[PDB]
Design a protein around this ligand. Structure first.
Ligand SMILES: CC[C@H](C)[C@H](NCc1c(COP(=O)(O)O)cnc(C)c1O)C(=O)O
Ligand SMILES: CC[C@H](C)[C@H](NCc1c(COP(=O)(O)O)cnc(C)c1O)C(=O)O
Ligand SMILES: CC[C@H](C)[C@H](NCc1c(COP(=O)(O)O)cnc(C)c1O)C(=O)O
Ligand SMILES: CC[C@H](C)[C@H](NCc1c(COP(=O)(O)O)cnc(C)c1O)C(=O)O
Lengths: 439, 440, 439, 440
């Protein structure tokens, strides 16, 4: 079942540092296609992680596979940091326009979402001439010294490595589930906007805040969407004070949320800056920061550039990846399957009381499990047990914040495989309730 | 116009793509390449003396690399090593552990770029030592991420308008063997620079609170300068006697570029606690790695250092094929031989062309420093611009460092006939510039 | 009436930086005694400010004046950084014992409360080996880069002078007066302790937090005392995580609150570190950091010291100051006149509904003005009128946060003077209601 | 008998007073003092050569200052200028703004210590220029507050255990004119050190982002080291050309200590943008001030920089008197005259005592650097210790700088008789060390 896989993981742990991996189970993938993973042992699973929302278009999509192998024969690499290639020129043009909004934009290439967010700090700082950056608790923007300082979802991203980047203030992200009693969405929006302002009313000058970076829906936080009114308040606040408005679309973008972009789950908001990564190259190492033209011109070279960034083989794969999304109606597909998945999960909650909250926007959801529906006490054990039952039954799914099931399969997932996956979870809950799982 | 398409395409790209993301030289829209041969969209062929900033050690589109890229992609394009495992990456992390310089057990951590690798060095060093301070050199380049960019010291536009930078970082002067004082021997240089090295430790920087010294055995972007043997030994000793980790940046000078596997092996008996790799690691595919002594790498918990796409299975395959080409075609030796060849050729050119003030070369990695007057050693950026622009017009691509130093880093697999063409174009370029035939 | 006063200030304003003063009145003091001020024109005023709670024992106190004169003849100054003098040895020993708690304590001198709070950062980091400091929004700790970074009461303390000291996190301070509908003190305490945790649950590791600095009662914030329950939750949390618990007694200490130390207004709380300043030497430049011996021995010379710090003249003045507090029973006097003062103001509140909130502990209080009781909207206009009517009727009083009247007279103030001052304040409110005062 | 009472008071103070707040030399428990005379609790007399870190330029307990203190204490012990005004402070701030070097209008701002004055400099420079980076020197001491301590560079214990320190700060070497390279002239020294000064600016530090350069015209803590005239001129010019404010620390070397009113007046026509004053300003009473060109001092709104006790009416009275005494007694001139004499006394000594490697002196303000051998210049801290204890046992109080440098900064009023007494004792000390007659 996992024999060949375990023998190898045990040799990788001698040579590969434990800091670079979050460990759940022994999974040594041989190959995969669409939403199906096959390990070296021959076990087939249904993928509900999509490699951390990096494979919206499914594993080894033939169009993407072909682009890669085609481009590799011509030019594996020549750095855009010095010269020019057709795939990159084409892709920067396309990203500049498909980004939300109608203001002219420019693009800057990276290898990872992390460096894209580092870029955001740069551009924001150089454009405004201000130094302070506001980010959110519960957020995750990367592992580079800039984007890690912004993050607030793991204490291990601060431990033993400080001091971090100076001039960063964190604020709390609106939690609509663990609220005070009798609190409407409007009250939640107003409460969290009060917290948002307190720093600006005490030690943090609004005139010296370069920007505010926010995930329209916090991924690592537990698929938490900020209330519509809250986003508007913060948005208005930024433009009223010269503070750039930046979004992290690294995880929640490219159709994940049932719209091209997660910020498009909101009314008429265009970001000054935004980070795109992961799925852009179907898992290949490509990222980008997109921004209003005037902001992207604020820096002179080489303020922000990487040798391997905007790799032609990777740019080709992103060009195919985007054609796949538009041509297979993946954005629209996600909104639909996300609505059907929500229904089945809301129905599961009528039978399984442990499922405290069902958050879902497109094929993008968080299934928050608790010990009691009225106390909302996190249940890491129920959640932990559910996934293992899933793994042993051909479904790969993980957790966020211990007790929340992370549901983010490839957007191209066939309906047959979704019902097949949604069933195994239905069983997992019963299996857990009837005390049948002991990890 | 030889560049009729290239110019038209760049005019559009400059509207959508930030200008800070590229150091502009020539209108070069590459269509395809192989070995040390590049072909633009207009059909013009060039000899590659830049190797995409030493990211193409084994030459463009090597069939083994191309094949590994195509084979691996079909089976699995990606699945993050930050959560799960794939065979190509398990194998590469093992190989990079043993081929790393020194004999101490080592562990590897993958990244995407040279920049994030050095960012990791800071963390691992800080985490292991329990100290916060980091020492790096002026004239260095470690990356474009907030950590590595703070360590760098080669471009004022890497500090400008993005401050404040990362705290607890101190810069020291890197030993310069060309612009020295009258009568200074190598021993004098080593001592003078080691003495500047100490000053901060003798004043405000506690040696006991310094997590590590990061250094380029040969500064690349700094103008291809090699630290004198004795200097490196003084520094290396000082670190050990004080519990400071000794880290090296091998992102540019590594993988057979200097004529050995690692630039550090040009120095006697030195094993680093931490080292950064990238670029040529996967023939230009985005893949880096930090490699350090086992006990250091273990000093951090997850997810202190990971990237979704770092250790990409396609890039891992690419890298294994790359490392195989270096071994099988004996590229390390070839660099040492053709390097030695290039060096003499350039030293002979210097005898006829006094604008060439200094010839620095180790493997097929060289800096040809151009100066107005050999006695004053005053930099001649205008001349070096002329040489390179003449070369471009004559089918040879080559850029500069620090304005006046010609950058010599072609793919290690370059055929002797093409190495000789390029050298002749360069020679011709020098004569052409002397006669005032080249206009910038 | 302000002739000589105004002519002198015009001449001063060409030479003294405007940032070195917050301007109220053309008040040039020639001399003073007890709670009576006398300007260079002959006008008399009752002091309700006490040089910012720096004159607890009253102006030109016989004991304190004589002490200063006698010491200046024997030795104006010798630095304790290098050599010893008797007045300093007695002071450092005495303070070490009159500090709250019975754990053994050591003392280190400074010149102002600012540098003492800078010391607290040093000693905390040193002892714990941790780098992160947690301070409060709405706090004021000093004008030195360390203490200024910890501060949170004026955006002008951050502007144009950054970057600030790294590894500092700001948490909100419990606000009893402006709460949400139907909140009890218990809800306030739990809410604010809930905000306090968020950072430790996201990006701030408790295990890497050296300390938490807090004012038992925020002075600059507006005489805001934190709920007993809150404090205990914080204090307990600190001990469970190895986080030192620091207090800033610079403003609210030395009997100001009706007990020796503002921290003693809470139950069984001994700080690991405490800053003292202001009134310790009757306004002479002298401060101190007092901590548990094990904490203070964590530093080697000269990590923290000052040339003029622990000055023999300012040490003598302090010894005499502490003698007055003890001999004249000023701690008890403050508790009593404070209890009395509070009831008088509570009584003024019932008759004057522009008094939104009456915060008082000992002879120190904030009298917050509002436009409407239900809204609790700040009424800066009214407050400014009151303080100008006051000055015009021989009473010197300033505001905190624009709308809060700062009631902090010398502890030795005579009941008659106190009553006359209170009566003028009563008249002021009545006058402002009748529309009789415009500046 | 001699220090028995002092050893019991000190044994008890060590239980309550932190060891970090004092540099321990001797069991000197002072009862009173006047001029350059110190008297312990046992009635022992000592000649003061430390002037309590040069905070007693006008001698201990000057009668005019004492009267100033007592008279004022009776009128008003304190009322903060942060909120209100008092005549003594208004007079002082006016006078400081005029006696400051240069003819450009100035504005003052009061603090309590040299430290907060230096933190203020950072603020003012950053606020005026809009730039963040500050440049200070190694071997410098500017204070114990987090800002000024970060600029400081004279002690490792001022950084240990307390970081991270204030960001955006770079340290540069100070010109050493004693431990030079063989054959170096003042010119050579000046150019070498100016060249080191530029390396950061030529590598990672953007000059257009450097708010200022803070410097001690003569380093006090460093060992009484004066920068060469030419060097200072070059740095001065560099600052003006790039908009970088030029700040000086006059806390230790100001108020007539060097033979001129300001240490910077030892150089030709150099007016600072910002400067810091303290110590002697108020004859030891806690008062400091930052002084700068008006336009610079107007770049902050309140309360960016203020202290409750800062500008205390008694301290200002003390300061006003101390300034009249300097003037009335011609102390500036006396520092130069008696400084020139003391310098010769020490040079005559150096002729018979070759352990005296260097005699640095400017006013009654010197550093007598003691070495093991004149050729090698190896520091002899052992000898220094012995000399200072021998001096202490024979009624002369004096301490060292950097372990091997004797610190010479008595009260400027020192009577010639006492000066010769002390001098003769230090001579006796050298002879005594020579003969191994002194054991610590
Ligand atoms: C442990 C979290 C893992 C690494 C991962 N974090 C992704 C992430 C990144 C990181 O971009 P890289 O990692 O591509 O540089 C940036 N921004 C957001 C919003 C992200 O969500 C995840 O969410 O699964
Ligand atoms: C202008 C910088 C250019 C592209 C490039 N320098 C890249 C570089 C990097 C960053 O590696 P990335 O860029 O993969 O993160 C890291 N370390 C060294 C020594 C490097 O030399 C050069 O040498 O031309
Ligand atoms: C150990 C050095 C001792 C304390 C002392 N240092 C004083 C000093 C200060 C500190 O000013 P404070 O101490 O008034 O804040 C600031 N600037 C210079 C040039 C100084 O020289 C000395 O000179 O002996
Ligand atoms: C604007 C606040 C003014 C100046 C003043 N603040 C004093 C203060 C200080 C400053 O101590 P210093 O300045 O002696 O170093 C430190 N800590 C607390 C709690 C303080 O309250 C006040 O309370 O009116």
């Amino acid at each position: 079942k996992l024999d060949k896989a375990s023998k190898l993981i045990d040799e990788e742990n001698k040579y590969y540092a434990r800091s670079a991996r979050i460990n759940y189970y022994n999974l040594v993938i041989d190959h995969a296609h669409g939403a199906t993973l096959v390990d070296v042992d021959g076990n087939k699973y249904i993928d509900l992680l999509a490699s951390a929302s990096a494979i919206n278009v499914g594993h080894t999509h033939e169009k993407v596979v072909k682009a890669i192998a085609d481009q590799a024969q011509k030019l594996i690499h020549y750095t855009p940091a010095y010269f020019h290639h057709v795939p990159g020129m084409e892709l920067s043009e396309k990203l500049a326009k498909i980004a939300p909004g109608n203001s002219p934009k420019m693009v800057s290439f990276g290898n990872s979402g992390s460096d894209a967010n580092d870029a955001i700090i740069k551009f924001a700082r150089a454009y405004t001439g201000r130094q302070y950056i506001v980010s959110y608790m519960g957020s995750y923007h990367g592992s580079t010294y800039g984007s890690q300082t912004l993050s607030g979802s793991s204490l291990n991203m601060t431990r033993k490595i400080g001091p971090m980047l100076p001039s960063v203030v964190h604020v709390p992200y609106p939690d609509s589930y663990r609220t005070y009693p009798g609190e409407t969405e409007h009250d939640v929006s107003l409460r969290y906007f009060n917290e948002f302002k307190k720093p600006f009313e005490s030690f943090l000058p609004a005139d010296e805040t370069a920007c505010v970076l926010i995930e329209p829906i916090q991924g690592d936080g537990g698929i938490i969407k900020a209330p519509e009114e809250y986003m508007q308040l913060v948005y208005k606040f930024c433009h009223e004070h010269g503070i750039l408005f930046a979004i992290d679309e690294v995880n929640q973008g490219l159709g994940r949320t049932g719209k091209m972009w997660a910020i498009q789950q909101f009314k008429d908001i265009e970001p000054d800056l935004m980070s795109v990564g992961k799925s852009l190259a179907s898992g290949m190492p490509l990222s980008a920061v997109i921004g209003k033209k005037e902001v992207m011109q604020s820096l002179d070279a080489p303020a922000h550039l990487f040798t391997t960034a905007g790799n032609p083989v990777c740019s080709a794969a992103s060009l195919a990846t985007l054609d796949v999304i538009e041509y297979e109606g993946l954005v629209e597909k996600s909104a639909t399957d996300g609505a059907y998945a929500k229904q089945r999960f809301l129905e599961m909650q009528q039978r399984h009381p442990m499922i405290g909250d069902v958050r879902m926007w497109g094929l993008n959801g968080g299934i928050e499990l608790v010990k009691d529906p009225k106390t909302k006490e996190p249940d890491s054990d129920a959640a932990t047990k559910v996934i293992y039952y899933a793994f042993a039954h051909g479904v790969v799914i993980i957790t966020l914040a211990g007790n929340i099931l992370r549901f983010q399969p490839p957007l191209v997932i066939p309906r047959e495989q979704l019902d097949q996956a949604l069933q195994v979870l239905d069983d997992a809950f019963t299996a857990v309730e009837n005390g049948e799982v002991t990890i």
